[PDB]
Design a protein around this nucleic acid. Sequence first.
RNA 1: CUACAAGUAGUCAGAGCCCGUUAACGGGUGAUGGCGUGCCUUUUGUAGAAUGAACCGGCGAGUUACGAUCUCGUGCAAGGUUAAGCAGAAGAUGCGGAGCCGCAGCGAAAGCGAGUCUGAAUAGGGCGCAUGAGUACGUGGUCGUAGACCCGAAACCAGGUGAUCUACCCAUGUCCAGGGUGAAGUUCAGGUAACACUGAAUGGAGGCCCGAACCCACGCACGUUGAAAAGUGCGGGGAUGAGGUGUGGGUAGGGGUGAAAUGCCAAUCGAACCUGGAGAUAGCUGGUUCUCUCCGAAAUAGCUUUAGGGCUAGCCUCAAGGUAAGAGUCUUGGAGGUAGAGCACUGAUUGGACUAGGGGCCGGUUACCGAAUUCAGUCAAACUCCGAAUGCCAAUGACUUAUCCUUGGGAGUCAGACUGCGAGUGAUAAGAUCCGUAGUCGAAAGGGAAACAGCCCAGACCGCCAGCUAAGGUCCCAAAG
RNA 2: UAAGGAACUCGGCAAAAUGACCCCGUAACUUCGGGAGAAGGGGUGCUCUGUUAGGGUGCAAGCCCGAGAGAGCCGCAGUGAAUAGGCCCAGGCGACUGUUUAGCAAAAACACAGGUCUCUGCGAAGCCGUAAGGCGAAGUAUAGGGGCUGACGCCUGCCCGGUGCUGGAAGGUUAAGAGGAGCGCUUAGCGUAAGCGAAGGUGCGAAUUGAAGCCCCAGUAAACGGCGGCCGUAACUAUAACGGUCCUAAGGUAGCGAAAUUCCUUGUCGGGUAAGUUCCGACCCGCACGAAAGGCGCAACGAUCUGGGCACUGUCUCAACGAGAGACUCGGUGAAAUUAUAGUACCUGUGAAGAUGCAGGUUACCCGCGACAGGACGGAAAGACCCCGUGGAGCUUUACUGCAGCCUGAUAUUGAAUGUUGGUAAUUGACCUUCUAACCCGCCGCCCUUAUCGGGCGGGGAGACAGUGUCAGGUGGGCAGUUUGACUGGGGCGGUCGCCUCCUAAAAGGUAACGGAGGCGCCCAAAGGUUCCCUCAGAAUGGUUGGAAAUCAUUCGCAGAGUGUAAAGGCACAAGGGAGCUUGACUGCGAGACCUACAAGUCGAGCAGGGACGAAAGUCGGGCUUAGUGAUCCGGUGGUUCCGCAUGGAAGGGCCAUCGCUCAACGGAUAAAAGCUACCCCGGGGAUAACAGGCUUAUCUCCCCCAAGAGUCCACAUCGACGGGGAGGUUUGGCACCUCGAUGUCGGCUCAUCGCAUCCUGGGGCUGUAGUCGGUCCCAAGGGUUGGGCUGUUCGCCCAUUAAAGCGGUACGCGAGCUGGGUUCAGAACGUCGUGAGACAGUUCGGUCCCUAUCCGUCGCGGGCGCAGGAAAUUUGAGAGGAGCUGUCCUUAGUACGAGAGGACCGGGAUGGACGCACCGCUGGUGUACCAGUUGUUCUGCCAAGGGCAUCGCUGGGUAGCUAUGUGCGGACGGGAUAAGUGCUGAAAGCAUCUAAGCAUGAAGCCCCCCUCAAGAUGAGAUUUCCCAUUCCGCAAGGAAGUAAGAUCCCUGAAAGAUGAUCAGGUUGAUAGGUCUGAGGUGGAAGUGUGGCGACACAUGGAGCUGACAGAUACUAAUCGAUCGAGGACUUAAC
RNA 3: UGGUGGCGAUAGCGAAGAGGUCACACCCGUUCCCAUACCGAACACGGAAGUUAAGCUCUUCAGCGCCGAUGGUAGUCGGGGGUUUCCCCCUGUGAGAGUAGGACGCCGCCAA
RNA 4: CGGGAAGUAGCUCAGCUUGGUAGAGCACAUGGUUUGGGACCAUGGGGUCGCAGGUUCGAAUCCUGUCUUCCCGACCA
RNA 5: CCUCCU
Length: 85
Amino acid sequence: ASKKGVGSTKNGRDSEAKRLGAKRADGQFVTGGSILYRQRGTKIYPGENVGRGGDDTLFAKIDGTVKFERFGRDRKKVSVYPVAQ
RNA sequence: CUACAAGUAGUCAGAGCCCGUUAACGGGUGAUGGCGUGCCUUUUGUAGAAUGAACCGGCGAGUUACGAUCUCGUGCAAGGUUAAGCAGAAGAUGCGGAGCCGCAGCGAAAGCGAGUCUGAAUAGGGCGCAUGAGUACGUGGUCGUAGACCCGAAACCAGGUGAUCUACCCAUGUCCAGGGUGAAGUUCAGGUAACACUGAAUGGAGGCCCGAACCCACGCACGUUGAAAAGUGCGGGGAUGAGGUGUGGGUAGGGGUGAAAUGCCAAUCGAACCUGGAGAUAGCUGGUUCUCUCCGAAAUAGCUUUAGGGCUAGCCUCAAGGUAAGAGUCUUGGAGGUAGAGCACUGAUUGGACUAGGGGCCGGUUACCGAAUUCAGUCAAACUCCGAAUGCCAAUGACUUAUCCUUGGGAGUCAGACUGCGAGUGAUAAGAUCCGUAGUCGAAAGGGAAACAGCCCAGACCGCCAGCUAAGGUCCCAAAG
RNA sequence: UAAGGAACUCGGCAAAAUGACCCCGUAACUUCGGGAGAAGGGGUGCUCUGUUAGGGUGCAAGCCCGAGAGAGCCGCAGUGAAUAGGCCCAGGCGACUGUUUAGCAAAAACACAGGUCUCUGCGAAGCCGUAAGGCGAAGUAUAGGGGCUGACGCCUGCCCGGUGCUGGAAGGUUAAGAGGAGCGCUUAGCGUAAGCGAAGGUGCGAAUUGAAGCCCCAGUAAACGGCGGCCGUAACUAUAACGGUCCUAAGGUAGCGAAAUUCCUUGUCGGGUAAGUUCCGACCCGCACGAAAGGCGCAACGAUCUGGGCACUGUCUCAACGAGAGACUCGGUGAAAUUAUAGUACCUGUGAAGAUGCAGGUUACCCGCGACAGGACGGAAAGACCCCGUGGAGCUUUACUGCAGCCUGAUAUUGAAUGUUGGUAAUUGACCUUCUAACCCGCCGCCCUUAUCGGGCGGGGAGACAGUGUCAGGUGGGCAGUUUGACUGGGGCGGUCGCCUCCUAAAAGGUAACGGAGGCGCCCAAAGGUUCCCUCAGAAUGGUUGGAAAUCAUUCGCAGAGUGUAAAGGCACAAGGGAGCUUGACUGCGAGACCUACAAGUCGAGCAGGGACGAAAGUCGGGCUUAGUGAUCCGGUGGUUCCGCAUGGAAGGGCCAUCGCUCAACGGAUAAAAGCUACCCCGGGGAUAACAGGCUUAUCUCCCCCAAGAGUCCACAUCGACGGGGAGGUUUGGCACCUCGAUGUCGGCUCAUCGCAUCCUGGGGCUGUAGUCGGUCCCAAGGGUUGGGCUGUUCGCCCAUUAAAGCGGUACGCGAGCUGGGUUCAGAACGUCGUGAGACAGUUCGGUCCCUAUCCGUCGCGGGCGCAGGAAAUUUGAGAGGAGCUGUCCUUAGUACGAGAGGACCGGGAUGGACGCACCGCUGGUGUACCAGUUGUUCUGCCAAGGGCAUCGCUGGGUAGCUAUGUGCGGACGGGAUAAGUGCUGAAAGCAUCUAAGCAUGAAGCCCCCCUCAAGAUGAGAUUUCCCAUUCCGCAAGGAAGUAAGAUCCCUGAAAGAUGAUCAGGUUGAUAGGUCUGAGGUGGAAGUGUGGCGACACAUGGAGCUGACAGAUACUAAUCGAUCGAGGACUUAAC
RNA sequence: UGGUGGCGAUAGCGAAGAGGUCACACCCGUUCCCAUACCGAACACGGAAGUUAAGCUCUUCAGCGCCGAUGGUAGUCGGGGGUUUCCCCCUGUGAGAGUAGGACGCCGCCAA
RNA sequence: CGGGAAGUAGCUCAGCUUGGUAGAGCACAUGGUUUGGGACCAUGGGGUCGCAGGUUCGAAUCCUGUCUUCCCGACCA
RNA sequence: CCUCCU
Ligand SMILES: [K+]
Ligand SMILES: [K+]
Ligand SMILES: [K+]
Ligand SMILES: [K+]
Ligand SMILES: [K+]
Ligand SMILES: [K+]
Ligand SMILES: [K+]
Ligand SMILES: [K+]
Ligand SMILES: [K+]
Ligand SMILES: [K+]
Ligand SMILES: [K+]
Ligand SMILES: [K+]
Ligand SMILES: [K+]
Ligand SMILES: [K+]
Ligand SMILES: [K+]
Ligand SMILES: [K+]
Ligand SMILES: [K+]
Ligand SMILES: [K+]
Ligand SMILES: [K+]
Ligand SMILES: [K+]
Ligand SMILES: [K+]
Ligand SMILES: [K+]
Ligand SMILES: [K+]
Ligand SMILES: [Mg+2]
Ligand SMILES: [Mg+2]
Ligand SMILES: [Mg+2]
Ligand SMILES: [Mg+2]
Ligand SMILES: [Mg+2]
Ligand SMILES: [Mg+2]
Ligand SMILES: [Mg+2]
Ligand SMILES: [Mg+2]
Ligand SMILES: [Mg+2]
Ligand SMILES: [Mg+2]
Ligand SMILES: [Mg+2]
Ligand SMILES: [Mg+2]
Ligand SMILES: [Mg+2]
Ligand SMILES: [Mg+2]
Ligand SMILES: [Mg+2]
Ligand SMILES: [Mg+2]
Ligand SMILES: [Mg+2]
Ligand SMILES: [Mg+2]
Ligand SMILES: [Mg+2]
Ligand SMILES: [Mg+2]
Ligand SMILES: [Mg+2]
Ligand SMILES: [Mg+2]
Ligand SMILES: [Mg+2]
Ligand SMILES: [Mg+2]
Ligand SMILES: [Mg+2]
Ligand SMILES: [Mg+2]
Ligand SMILES: [Mg+2]
Ligand SMILES: [Mg+2]
Ligand SMILES: [Mg+2]
Ligand SMILES: [Mg+2]
Ligand SMILES: [Mg+2]
Ligand SMILES: [Mg+2]
Ligand SMILES: [Mg+2]
Ligand SMILES: [Mg+2]
Ligand SMILES: [Mg+2]
Ligand SMILES: [Mg+2]
Ligand SMILES: [Mg+2]
Ligand SMILES: [Mg+2]
Ligand SMILES: [Mg+2]
Ligand SMILES: [Mg+2]
Ligand SMILES: [Mg+2]
Ligand SMILES: [Mg+2]
Ligand SMILES: [Mg+2]
Ligand SMILES: [Mg+2]
Ligand SMILES: [Mg+2]
Ligand SMILES: [Mg+2]
Ligand SMILES: [Mg+2]
Ligand SMILES: [Mg+2]
Ligand SMILES: [Mg+2]
Ligand SMILES: [Mg+2]
Ligand SMILES: [Mg+2]
Ligand SMILES: [Mg+2]
Ligand SMILES: [Mg+2]
Ligand SMILES: [Mg+2]
Ligand SMILES: [Mg+2]
Ligand SMILES: [Mg+2]
Ligand SMILES: [Mg+2]
Ligand SMILES: [Mg+2]
Ligand SMILES: [Mg+2]
Ligand SMILES: [Mg+2]
Ligand SMILES: [Mg+2]
Ligand SMILES: [Mg+2]
Ligand SMILES: [Mg+2]
Ligand SMILES: [Mg+2]
Ligand SMILES: [Mg+2]
Ligand SMILES: [Mg+2]
Ligand SMILES: [Mg+2]
Ligand SMILES: [Mg+2]
Ligand SMILES: [Mg+2]
Ligand SMILES: [Mg+2]
Ligand SMILES: [Mg+2]
Ligand SMILES: [Mg+2]
Ligand SMILES: [Mg+2]
Ligand SMILES: [Mg+2]
Ligand SMILES: [Mg+2]
Ligand SMILES: [Mg+2]
Ligand SMILES: [Mg+2]
Ligand SMILES: [Mg+2]
Ligand SMILES: [Mg+2]
Ligand SMILES: [Mg+2]
Ligand SMILES: [Mg+2]
Ligand SMILES: [Mg+2]
Ligand SMILES: [Mg+2]
Ligand SMILES: [Mg+2]
Ligand SMILES: [Mg+2]
Ligand SMILES: [Mg+2]
Ligand SMILES: [Mg+2]
Ligand SMILES: [Mg+2]
């Protein structure tokens, strides 16, 4: 039984998935430090009491409630507001 | 009971006949009717045209020791406990405190100590304390070291036994009916100056010829649970030789011997045989024995000289805790770029208008192509000016439901299958392959789809000669139009 | 064994033929021997002459051997039986006789004589052994060992670059051992401390010295090996003697060549054949010949291989008969493999995808006996193939690591002199030479001593060498232990392996494939930090050089740019551009998060220390973000309020910092690793390949749609592009679902059976159908469908036929049916590849084919019971099987048709081929209890006549029976209904219209007709005839007994037969034997006579003899017996 | 008017007008602080002769851009069916495009 | 079918690996030399690197595709 | 080194 020779692919590579995106929900309580969003670039901007890390990670600078919110016409931010106290 | 019957041999229904018991809504037999593809192993899936068992009987597989750890029990408890040994029934027990564990941790260590280490630090942080139980013994679960659940290699090494078979050799014997051919040499004759050379006779060479014994083994047939573990029959080859054969001897296994085939070395040879190391090792195959109950998987991820193995995680179970932390639905908020769609970007692309420019044809002209621009029009996994349904993450109560988490003991699983839906690979093939998602099978019997793991309906604790329905059905087989 | 004679087959395998002696005669070729038993022919008994000639023995007598003749005699035949070469032509291979895989290979393999290379000066080399001791060899270069080649003949070219071997040693490099310049630790002592530091001890240690080897220089190919491209060129073309150029150590000479080598390939041409994939001869595009792994020849030789002839034949056409051994029946004895239990049908389907057992149907009374193998994926053997195992073993090597051996140095044993030449002016190393006294002697004499051992003594030789010990370097598949990855739509081979980005990815996250695309293993001292300022691509227009595009100016300008680098996400309050100052490209950390099996990975506000920039606010722990990397162990370097084995130190460790991995197979097995196995083995797998099956149908085969064209015209007679749609499931595949505790695998043979897509024959439509022929389509599966050459072949080509030479399925139908050529083990060889061991759907020569049938199934044959009494016959036919083919000639008619050429339908008739049934009168075959001839020997005493054995001894005939090649006969003639087709009438639809109502016609096909079986046809049928209603038990229901008609046991047998069965008979009986008479067969008995010297001939006499054949005849045997076998249920209806 | 904010361009472009004592500009200088990879252009320091031409402020406008329903349609969760590369049905949900329409600014605080 | 290697002037070859320059021999052309050829001497010219696309400021050179011509492989069944 | 044919 004859078997035709076959070629090869020059593809077959991919990097590890980086588990990007939202890490806390709108309206969820977070502690200071909590990563809110992982991203390349600013898909979402740091709002009130939120920071942008060296790799564009958005994180809560205080304890409080996460609010994702429209930032002008085209953009989005995420903010953390203190609880009513 | 049985000669018109289609048989995993029963089971349920059932006359007839024959009986009469541990006296029971009894026993034997069984015309006929319905249903019904053994058991085990291994599998995605086995009635399997895969595996195992002729039958019956007996025998035949998680053990024990010493350590570790957990649960349970008991004694004592900030303590607990003795070992060897001595005495004593091979005993209990008494003595024996050496030793061991615990009561304090932190640090690599010096060391400090309810703290300590890091650090320049009264900082912060790590591990501890505060947040207190151990220890001795026993049973049980599991682990470790031992053959460690049982059976099974091919092999490896050590020490031996074999050349009464066979290989070659050594010493010493012996065998080979018959027939043929006619080398050298010699003689004689011829022959020449001598020799050459010629003829005839003689002579008896030879891994010479034909052919019995003997040895061999070329062809065919037969035989193939044989007359025979290599033969017989008919033919065949050698048959004075590198011959056959007897007796007595020699060479021995990491070795001999080989006119060389890895041949032969006692029916064994790519390394003999026997015993031992030895219960070698086997991530492999097979097997692993009483019952019922409660619960009940996986066939995945990651890493692996890894891919049919393993480990951690996932999923199961048991206990103790926490406890109500889980889940469904409604409501509310949010992240996100798929389906669709669109052309705003990138790329592809059709027609018209339009010409820069190029090409045929004279700085001049053409049915030849044309960039841009413009009008209209198509398309896209790696296009997006847009953008759902769902799914996901949460919050908030409400209505409902009972899960959920932690710690510890014990696993198994890492071959999956098909079906529907969304993709890739393929040829928009495969009962194909590879993901995603739901189901069923696996591990699920019952009804339907003739039969038919995976489809449709539906989850078997038992009994009933009750009833209602599901899918699918209602002329007869075959319940109901 | 008729006729034939290789047609058989892979192949003349097997068989047949040949065969003794004497004589004649005998070719090519040759190594002059051979070839040769070449070939091809002739003779062959017996009698007499004849106790021949002649010979041996002997005094003779005699005995023995014995040609060659002549004359006869007999037979079918005289080596009368048994035993006893077939031969020839040509080629390959090996020169030859030998040898070999005990037990699948006898060969082309091995050996061989011969050649050559090479080593070896004798304690030889080589080999065995640790050594002693040995072999070598009681040999000595004309000898011995090793490698290669393989008689003989002619020959044996080129390359020394590589590798090996040999020689060389000027230099380089290199060990132990010498050597000890320095340095460290320690501490007497000295120092307020810090430090310094004598001596000693101790730990390191540089220069220098140091052999062989290696590098290096040469040589060597009958050492290992190797021995080229491209382009141009001649006055026809073609080809290029000739030239150019690149490369090499050198480019393959002679010879041979489609080959044991040639893929393409059945090369081409010639020969041989009717036909030749093989064979021989040529040619040369030598895939991939080639000169001692020899080249080319070659007489002789071969159980060698190949091709062709003569002879010969049962090899075959195509089979028939006979003998014996089994088989079969009876008596005796009596295993085995296998086995889940089996009351064990068929079809189609289903299903783990190929069912006795499942479904639905169809069929089937119960039990055997002889037979056959289709199935039980039959038995046998835990598949040798293939894969897998971090399983083995054997083998290889420039795999790794070792070891033996060998070489080389140092040092000990080991001493004495002499010069010479290096540090050190007198002391120590190196070197050369000499000595003798160690050591050695496989030298001599003497002694122990009857001794080729050993020892002693004395000579001689050699000599501080050698040998040996220790240490060291080199060499070293000679030997040893091992390694030699995984993924993978089987494995190998190719590719890949970690990290980053995108898509696939189904709008969270995640998500596979040997899916689709790309990047990375860095870079930057600014391309980092901060402060301040800024805006890009491109276009248009103007303008020196200057263009399409340099720099300048204006205008337009969400970015069409840029962002170190891939991509994505981002970025114009810039994250893009510019400038100033800087080093936060910080140290200690770090609430809390993300990610996650772990190990790791990511983000982080904030705190402290000390800074950079900024007036300040503030920002800064590298870079727009996301790659740019690697665990542990081990080791190095720096630091250190740590440890420091009595103490002080130190050595060494710890801790912090940091360095060394294409550990890239990137979670890294080791510091250190490649191959072959067809000599292979074990554990496993249908988890995974090869055969067959299944799914699929790309490919394949077939059929269609559209209709552009072709066809003068004309798409559609015929063909049909571009495109489109299917069917089938015979191809190659894809997939990997059954089977690896075995599903034997190509072709052929034997036996078929099915489909129809039809090859022929039958029936038709259309035709570019005049006729005869055809083309094309439709119906049709009844029957039929050849023998050869070549090749293992399927296929194909060819020869010759034929009505035709169909295509497919059935596990590529059929190996428990056969074969075994091929494929597919072990041997050997060629080309080729490989350093090698070895390897090749390349080739070549050779190479073990097991099984007693249980079940179903198939073919035959019995027994049982049934079929409302028991019997004997004859039957109907539900139903089943069989058969089913076709040519040629004559005639119609040279008619129809046609210019002619040619030449029919339809219809008559005759006769064949192939096939089948029966049968032996005919022709033949066979004919083992028939007749005859004949050889040898042996027996019946001898002669004569006979018997036995030699294949039935052989040879010539042959009866019955059984038989084909022999004879006879068959498929005839028709009905019925139909297919395609043709219609008639006829409307729907005023017409038309084969159809809707109605009515026909019409195939080798369907149902009959013809032949056979058939009532288990459980639906058990019918007709005719026979027996006759018994007895006893019983309430009857039943039961028992003896019988009738009839049958059987037993017996004689054959027309029957494995056995049963069947049939003819069983005494008023011709059943068989015998007997008698015949037929046929043989061919002329014995005895006697006559003739002849005799072998023999003739007569008596178509005699004698004669299995199975015919008739007759109770002479013999079928004796006497016994056994079995009805008394007929009930109901209803008509009588 | 000026400053300074918040709100998705409904705020923007573009077009046509109107306005300036003060305020905001342009404007006029380079002695000084400071400045230009050259340039007092800009930045900086100073001034007030001029001017609303431009910026700025205020009107008007729907050409471009922006915002944008309702209905319908595509798609689709769930449930069924079929002639199954795909399609249909039913209770939900529901775009994009297109369009009606909106829109040439809305809301602060301070100073004058 | 799978894997390689080439492709540069008329012909044969370098250059490619390292991006910036198109070389070399023979041939060709012109002159000289010769009675005339040949040889010899002197002096010149000739591609845009197979084709297409890409990366780059820039491609014979780096990347891809394609075409042509060679070479190797196609094993176990 | 060569020197077309008659
Ligand atoms: K039953
Ligand atoms: K099996
Ligand atoms: K602390
Ligand atoms: K306790
Ligand atoms: K155990
Ligand atoms: K051996
Ligand atoms: K699925
Ligand atoms: K041999
Ligand atoms: K032949
Ligand atoms: K021969
Ligand atoms: K099965
Ligand atoms: K059978
Ligand atoms: K496959
Ligand atoms: K690895
Ligand atoms: K098969
Ligand atoms: K069709
Ligand atoms: K198998
Ligand atoms: K067989
Ligand atoms: K069989
Ligand atoms: K059976
Ligand atoms: K006859
Ligand atoms: K009957
Ligand atoms: K007579
Ligand atoms: Mg095949
Ligand atoms: Mg960074
Ligand atoms: Mg019946
Ligand atoms: Mg019955
Ligand atoms: Mg059935
Ligand atoms: Mg399976
Ligand atoms: Mg098994
Ligand atoms: Mg069994
Ligand atoms: Mg060993
Ligand atoms: Mg012995
Ligand atoms: Mg002996
Ligand atoms: Mg002889
Ligand atoms: Mg002989
Ligand atoms: Mg014999
Ligand atoms: Mg043996
Ligand atoms: Mg052991
Ligand atoms: Mg449960
Ligand atoms: Mg394994
Ligand atoms: Mg686990
Ligand atoms: Mg779409
Ligand atoms: Mg799966
Ligand atoms: Mg599948
Ligand atoms: Mg399972
Ligand atoms: Mg079920
Ligand atoms: Mg059922
Ligand atoms: Mg099951
Ligand atoms: Mg009913
Ligand atoms: Mg004959
Ligand atoms: Mg004859
Ligand atoms: Mg033949
Ligand atoms: Mg034949
Ligand atoms: Mg023969
Ligand atoms: Mg020979
Ligand atoms: Mg011989
Ligand atoms: Mg043998
Ligand atoms: Mg032998
Ligand atoms: Mg043999
Ligand atoms: Mg010796
Ligand atoms: Mg000797
Ligand atoms: Mg040889
Ligand atoms: Mg030879
Ligand atoms: Mg030579
Ligand atoms: Mg050769
Ligand atoms: Mg040679
Ligand atoms: Mg089943
Ligand atoms: Mg099926
Ligand atoms: Mg079936
Ligand atoms: Mg079975
Ligand atoms: Mg079997
Ligand atoms: Mg079986
Ligand atoms: Mg096996
Ligand atoms: Mg084998
Ligand atoms: Mg080895
Ligand atoms: Mg070992
Ligand atoms: Mg593998
Ligand atoms: Mg593969
Ligand atoms: Mg590879
Ligand atoms: Mg999703
Ligand atoms: Mg996602
Ligand atoms: Mg280690
Ligand atoms: Mg000390
Ligand atoms: Mg790895
Ligand atoms: Mg590893
Ligand atoms: Mg071999
Ligand atoms: Mg061998
Ligand atoms: Mg095996
Ligand atoms: Mg399978
Ligand atoms: Mg197959
Ligand atoms: Mg099968
Ligand atoms: Mg699969
Ligand atoms: Mg089996
Ligand atoms: Mg047909
Ligand atoms: Mg096939
Ligand atoms: Mg077959
Ligand atoms: Mg068979
Ligand atoms: Mg064979
Ligand atoms: Mg070679
Ligand atoms: Mg092979
Ligand atoms: Mg080959
Ligand atoms: Mg009938
Ligand atoms: Mg007769
Ligand atoms: Mg006859
Ligand atoms: Mg006589
Ligand atoms: Mg006798
Ligand atoms: Mg005798
Ligand atoms: Mg009857
Ligand atoms: Mg008689
Ligand atoms: Mg809308």
